[PDB]
């Protein structure tokens, strides 16, 4: 029944503060050690901190000692991570996870924390029109921070879609393209709409791809 829901992530300035919460359900929260684990956007898993079942002992990765405080509340079946003096390298997805016979026996979806001096900014969406199998797509350019979502035909177009991982440009803003290859015979008998969603800047854009 085990369920773990992290929340509280977001984008913050270097030196800022954030408090993560993790709501635990479906297991006896209070008899288990609880931990935070993080994963920087391109990298491997990295243990952050662990708190004992009773809250009596806490253990920290040394690059976060003093700056971070792991705690728990038995009344609420919730774990917390208080994060201060945030650094760019704290940027990561943060997971909470109980220890059974194994550390991190179950994982929630995580919560994304971005520490940057750059400003939030919604993307621009540009057609990549076609002109055998044809190919077409959208350019989703100059946004910050991650993530954006892009879909095609509001989820009806699934096979042969390719949304590329975003790359950080020289300007410090992200940019990607989403493309799909269809049969050429369908150009005309099939409308092509890319649906771009950037929650951090509160931006939605839909775009028809023609000719």
């Amino acid at each position: 029944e085990v369920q773990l829901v992290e929340s509280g992530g977001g984008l913050v300035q270097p030196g800022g503060s954030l408090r993560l919460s993790c709501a635990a359900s479906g297991f006896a929260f209070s008899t288990y050690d609880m931990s935070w684990v993080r994963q920087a956007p391109g990298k491997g898993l990295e243990w952050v901190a662990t708190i004992s079942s009773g809250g009596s002992y806490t253990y920290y990765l040394d690059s976060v000692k003093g700056r971070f405080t792991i705690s728990r509340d038995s009344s609420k079946n919730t774990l917390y991570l208080q994060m201060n003096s945030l650094r760019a390298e704290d940027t990561a997805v943060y997971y909470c996870a109980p220890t059974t016979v194994v550390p991190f026996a179950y994982w929630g979806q995580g919560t994304l924390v971005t520490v940057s001096s750059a400003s939030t900014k919604g993307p621009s969406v540009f057609p990549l029109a076609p002109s055998g199998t044809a190919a077409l797509g959208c350019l989703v350019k100059d946004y910050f921070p991650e993530p954006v979502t892009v879909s095609w035909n509001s989820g009806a177009l699934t096979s042969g879609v390719h949304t590329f991982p975003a790359v950080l440009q020289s300007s410090g803003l992200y940019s990607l393209s989403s493309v799909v290859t269809v049969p050429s015979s369908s150009l005309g008998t099939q409308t092509y709409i890319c649906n771009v969603n950037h929650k951090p800047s509160n931006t939605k854009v839909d775009k028809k791809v023609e000719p």
């Binding site: 991190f104 990549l128 029109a129 190919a135 493309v179």
Partner: protein, 213 residues
């Protein structure tokens, strides 16, 4: 601090095959080692605890073994669900340390890219930036070279590449190469092309356009 070293960093294998990933600890950690599985974009799944025990819901093909400093994950028969990145962990002592991971990807046959090029759309140009995009679709193996020629002059430093994960249907990669230019310097020049070298191509491929078409 105990370091955890995984080997190899990556490996290709085909469905039904048998793979073996190894981890080495800088110190004795008895049997207090676990293994985790992560698929791209997803949360991890815990597989093995205390060196050799399957966690709940983990199928028979998975097996771990080892002791002291020499640990092993064995998959007896790769299925589609098993292509993912695998991490080892020591929790003998704090700090708990993961290994760097081994990425496990699907071995398949050579497939040559379908190449497409996209001039900056009129909407983008109406904004003071140009983006020329070179698309490489559905190819294997991952290695590919993409060069830009602007009026037969080779570019360097000004293009950015991005590559999808191994696709789940056909096990190919796809790649975007984006030449980033001022609206100004982009219209100074007349013929745009990207050349693709790929093992499945008998000849390097070129796709071109002229600005005004």
């Amino acid at each position: 601090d105990i370091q955890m070293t995984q080997s190899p960093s990556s490996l290709s294998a085909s469905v039904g095959d048998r793979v073996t990933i190894t981890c080495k600890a800088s110190q004795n950690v008895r049997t207090v080692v676990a293994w985790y599985q992560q698929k791209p974009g997803k949360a991890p799944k815990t597989l093995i605890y205390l060196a050799s025990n399957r966690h709940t819901g983990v199928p028979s093909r998975f097996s771990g073994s080892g002791s002291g400093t020499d640990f092993t994950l064995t998959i007896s028969s790769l299925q589609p669900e098993d292509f993912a990145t695998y991490f080892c962990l020591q929790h003998w002592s704090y700090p708990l340390t993961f290994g760097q991971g081994t990425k496990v990807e699907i071995k398949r046959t050579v497939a040559a890219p379908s190449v497409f090029i996209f001039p900056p759309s009129d909407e983008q140009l109406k904004s003071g930036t140009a983006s020329v995009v070179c698309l490489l679709n559905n190819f294997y193996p991952r290695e590919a070279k993409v060069q830009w020629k602007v009026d037969n002059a080779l570019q360097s430093g000004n293009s950015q590449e991005s590559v999808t994960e191994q696709d789940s249907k056909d096990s190919t990669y796809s790649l975007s190469s984006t030449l980033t230019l001022s609206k100004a310097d982009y219209e100074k020049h007349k013929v745009y092309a990207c050349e693709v070298t790929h093992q499945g191509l008998s000849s390097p491929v070129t796709k071109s356009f002229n600005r005004g078409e």
